[PDB]
Design a protein around this ligand. Sequence first.
Ligand SMILES: Nc1nc2c(ncn2[C@@H]2O[C@@H]3COP(=O)(O)O[C@H]4[C@@H](O)[C@H](n5cnc6c(=O)[nH]c(N)nc65)O[C@@H]4COP(=O)(O)O[C@H]3[C@H]2O)c(=O)[nH]1
Ligand SMILES: [Mg+2]
Ligand SMILES: [Mg+2]
Ligand SMILES: [Mg+2]
Ligand SMILES: [Mg+2]
Length: 87
Amino acid sequence: RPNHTIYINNLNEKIKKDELKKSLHAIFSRFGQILDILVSRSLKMRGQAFVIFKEVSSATNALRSMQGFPFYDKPMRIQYAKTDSDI
RNA sequence: GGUCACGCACAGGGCAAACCAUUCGAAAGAGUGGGACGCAAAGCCUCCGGCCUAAACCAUUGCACUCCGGUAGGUAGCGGGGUUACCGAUGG
Ligand SMILES: Nc1nc2c(ncn2[C@@H]2O[C@@H]3COP(=O)(O)O[C@H]4[C@@H](O)[C@H](n5cnc6c(=O)[nH]c(N)nc65)O[C@@H]4COP(=O)(O)O[C@H]3[C@H]2O)c(=O)[nH]1
Ligand SMILES: [Mg+2]
Ligand SMILES: [Mg+2]
Ligand SMILES: [Mg+2]
Ligand SMILES: [Mg+2]
């Protein structure tokens, strides 16, 4: 189940792309090295985020310590992602 | 001369990009004033395609690393199409 990238769900869809990036970057940065944060506001990608950590241990700590977290008045739903391509 | 085209001019000229000031706007962008990159319809119109914006509303819980909700607004100086018009190369 565990993975380098975490998949963040049920996000407030009214927050702009670049404010959400910055807000996620300042929150999850303490858990470990963040490679990139994937956020877009298209129909299929609304309310969603992919936070990529350099190591799984930091991602597991990120997933468990902040699951169900109140974020812009919405519960954060964290599960693992399936395949981190990029490069 | 008319009409429909056309732009090698002539002639009166017309408009105004970027930038700046200011107003409106959530934004894209628009108005007004200065200002000219250009423009033979760079006059006018969102009917079709593209591009740009996302405040409100409706819809959407969606696994991405081409891009993509409806809607609403915008660009006519992004094309196409519609419409109106000045000059007239011994002009076609
Ligand atoms: N009266 C008239 N004359 C025409 C027309 N078409 C061509 N000409 C003549 O041909 C010249 C070159 O035209 P252009 O290559 O379209 O190049 C033009 C054009 O791009 C632009 N321009 C000038 N006036 C206008 C205008 O009222 N509307 C537009 N869209 N462009 C203009 O400036 C350039 C130079 O203009 P000019 O010194 O007048 O010089 C013009 C003019 O003498 C027309 O429909 N009516
Ligand atoms: Mg002249
Ligand atoms: Mg002016
Ligand atoms: Mg003409
Ligand atoms: Mg308009």
